[PDB]
């Protein structure tokens, strides 16, 4: 038995921002009726989780992720043709690639500033070499070091600026943006499908030690963040893994009491944790909040 939500809550105005999309860059997405609806619902079903798991109710991550996947569905817009994705796990021979565009943009600057980023050449059957700036996630898991996402930047901008214009003309739009839909020179390749068992089984692994009873403020509050970061940085199902991972760490949290206020506006929860090691993450969770 673990103390189950708070009878405290968070402001209403913070209850809409829960599981909001608040990029640093682009700002106009209040649309009150559906995005606030959706932000206080998530905030709703993540306290109903978190009492079935004061309770007993959920007993893995495994589950805890299916009952945040049900309420993530159910947000859809009925006849919604992306809904089978976002109730489907990723598989190998699946989608994993994010070109970064809008409203992703903001996260060229972020991998070229990147303090971990490195110096790499692209090899481009389009492009022809480019210099990119480089940022490889890994992660420690039982001694294996595994390459979760890859960010690439392009950083010849001017050549870039050009080619595309002329590469749009000379192959045509449809072509060329189905080629970019892959090899946008600047892109996120995702952590490969092929290590979502073993992720999944290391998710829970941290829910079992997440739901302890005896744990300090300091540990819960670390594996509130742990399990957020792997799920968000493994992006488990094909559509809609960052919500159900935030959706998932503050049930976790809000199953001992802790009321998570949102994230800070500009920062954008999954993409701070693709961006960082998990020591790092860890640390620096308190600080993406309120």
Same mark, same amino acid.
């Given at each position: 038995?673990?103390?189950?939500?708070?009878?405290?809550?968070?402001?209403?105005?913070?209850?809409?921002?829960?599981?909001?999309?608040?990029?640093?860059?682009?700002?106009?997405?209040?649309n009150?009726?559906?995005n606030?609806?959706?932000?206080?619902?998530?905030?709703?079903?993540?306290?109903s989780?978190?009492?079935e798991?004061?309770?007993?109710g959920?007993?893995?991550?495994?589950?805890?992720?299916?009952?945040?996947?049900?309420?993530?569905?159910?947000?859809?817009?009925?006849?919604?043709?992306?809904?089978?994705?976002?109730?489907?796990?990723?598989?190998?021979?699946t989608?994993?690639?994010t070109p970064?565009?809008?409203?992703?943009?903001?996260?060229?600057?972020?991998?070229?500033?990147?303090?971990?980023?490195?110096d790499?050449?692209?090899?481009?059957?389009?492009?022809g070499?480019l210099?990119?700036?480089?940022? #490889?996630?890994? @992660?420690?898991? =039982? %001694?294996?070091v595994? $390459?979760?996402?890859?960010?690439?930047?392009?950083? /010849?901008? &001017?050549?870039?600026?050009?080619?595309?214009?002329?590469?749009?003309?000379?192959?045509?739009?449809?072509?060329?943006?189905?080629?970019?839909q892959?090899?946008?020179?600047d892109?996120?390749?995702?952590t490969?499908?092929?290590?979502?068992?073993?992720?999944?089984?290391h998710?829970?692994?941290?829910?079992?030690?997440?739901?302890s009873?005896?744990?300090?403020?300091?540990?819960?509050?670390?594996?509130?963040?742990?399990?957020?970061?792997?799920?968000?940085?493994?992006?488990?199902?094909?559509r809609?893994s960052?919500?159900?991972?935030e959706?998932?760490? #503050?049930?976790? @949290?809000?199953? =001992? %009491?802790?009321?998570? $206020?949102?994230?800070?506006?500009?920062?954008?929860? /999954?993409? &701070?944790?693709?961006?960082?090691?998990?020591?790092?993450?860890?640390?620096k969770?308190?600080?993406?909040?309120?």
């Amino acid at each position: 038995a673990l103390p189950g939500p708070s009878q405290r809550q968070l402001e209403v105005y913070d209850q809409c921002l829960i599981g909001a999309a608040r990029w640093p860059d682009d700002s106009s997405k209040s649309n009150t009726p559906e995005n606030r609806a959706y932000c206080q619902s998530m905030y709703n079903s993540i306290r109903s989780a978190g009492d079935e798991i004061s309770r007993g109710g959920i007993t893995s991550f495994e589950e805890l992720w299916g009952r945040a996947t049900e309420w993530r569905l159910s947000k859809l817009q009925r006849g919604e043709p992306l809904y089978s994705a976002f109730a489907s796990e990723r598989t190998s021979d699946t989608d994993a690639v994010t070109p970064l565009v809008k409203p992703y943009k903001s996260v060229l600057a972020r991998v070229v500033d990147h303090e971990d980023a490195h110096d790499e050449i692209m090899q481009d059957n389009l492009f022809g070499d480019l210099n990119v700036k480089v940022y #490889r996630q890994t @992660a420690y898991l =039982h %001694g294996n070091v595994i $390459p979760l996402n890859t960010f690439r930047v392009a950083t /010849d901008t &001017e050549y870039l600026r050009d080619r595309v214009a002329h590469l749009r003309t000379e192959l045509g739009a449809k072509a060329l943006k189905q080629h970019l839909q892959r090899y946008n020179p600047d892109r996120i390749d995702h952590t490969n499908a092929s290590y979502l068992p073993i992720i999944k089984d290391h998710l829970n692994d941290l829910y079992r030690q997440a739901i302890s009873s005896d744990l300090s403020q300091a540990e819960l509050i670390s594996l509130i963040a742990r399990t957020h970061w792997w799920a968000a940085s493994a992006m488990p199902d094909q559509r809609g893994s960052a919500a159900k991972a935030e959706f998932a760490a #503050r049930a976790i @949290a809000s199953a =001992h %009491g802790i009321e998570l $206020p949102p994230f800070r506006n500009g920062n954008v929860s /999954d993409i &701070e944790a693709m961006l960082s090691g998990e020591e790092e993450f860890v640390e620096k969770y308190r600080s993406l909040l309120d």
